[PDB]
Amino acid sequence: MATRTQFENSNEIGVFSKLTNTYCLVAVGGSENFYSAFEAELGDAIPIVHTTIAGTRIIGRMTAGNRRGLLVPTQTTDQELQHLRNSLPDSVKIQRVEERLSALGNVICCNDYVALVHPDIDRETEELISDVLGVEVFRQTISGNILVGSYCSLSNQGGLVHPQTSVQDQEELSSLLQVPLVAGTVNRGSSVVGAGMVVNDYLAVTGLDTTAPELSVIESIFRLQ
Template identity: 55%
Template structure:
């Protein structure tokens, strides 16, 4: 299901994956509690800062395999805290001409260079999970078909927070739940839940698969 939080820019101050959730260390207690109430029984919810700032959702990329941080994340205490809390690799990287290789190595995924509706900030204008993607509302049907072929998941176009095109700032998702800004309308919620197939999703099934994967990786 999709959860509304009494805040608009949830994707700026949090990062949600199937294995963990990061929340800005100086976020309000109500903001943190909204995540903890939904997720604490399933995955760790960790308060942190990245590179000394609270805009953690815009400064990292992560999944169950690892977490990619900006090169100026030099606080070793922060890095060790994240590695210990998340039980995954947390790496600080300067993205250069080998950007694709770095991302593929840390996150264990295929990487493609693309734009979203002619916009370069793909993380701001598209939100992605293993079950679907929500792109900029002006993304053409042809482009969505191309994305769906690349990503191997259904791609929809939509908005958050009563018409905001910056979906990555107002929405964060994993394979069974989503959090969006309080101003997100009922129609936008419907599109989000359909795009990421959230009504059919249950965390238990995903966690069983993840636990099996972790066990196999240590055997």
């Protein structure tokens, strides 16, 4: 399941894509090599929606969601929202959350049961996200990192955080999330583990820079096998 994959010439897989347990987003630009690479592991179980967000190829960070729904920033155009609605499954809902922040994937990280949000996020947006995803919401930061989603990665299995996290912070995050937590690294020590790669309960994708020890750590924490 854990297979090495690369963008055109970028190791930031999660910037241009955002894999989920029931759907996957990929930038329309480039070539179908990324699309076919994701299809190989994903087969044809769920639709792989080629789509853009506000005309950018960073849709992976702009948007965020879970199995029960997908959230997009207000900057998203009407055509993109319509395409997402007509391509995503009926269970997944989409809405034009009217809040100041834009990068849901960077500012917010969540899984099918637990979601972390910015401490300053508006109450209405928090309630909407909770209703859409069917998950609990908690105000937290990873060792003072304002961009929780840019460093923290979380699925139903164990989670991964950037190495700078302290032992006490790692333990607190694991306790709050009720998931195994290991302070691993990806893309040759890159600190963008929360946004430079994608992973879910069955599939893990990362750049070629991920060394064999890093792949082994990812497999052990996520227990793909």
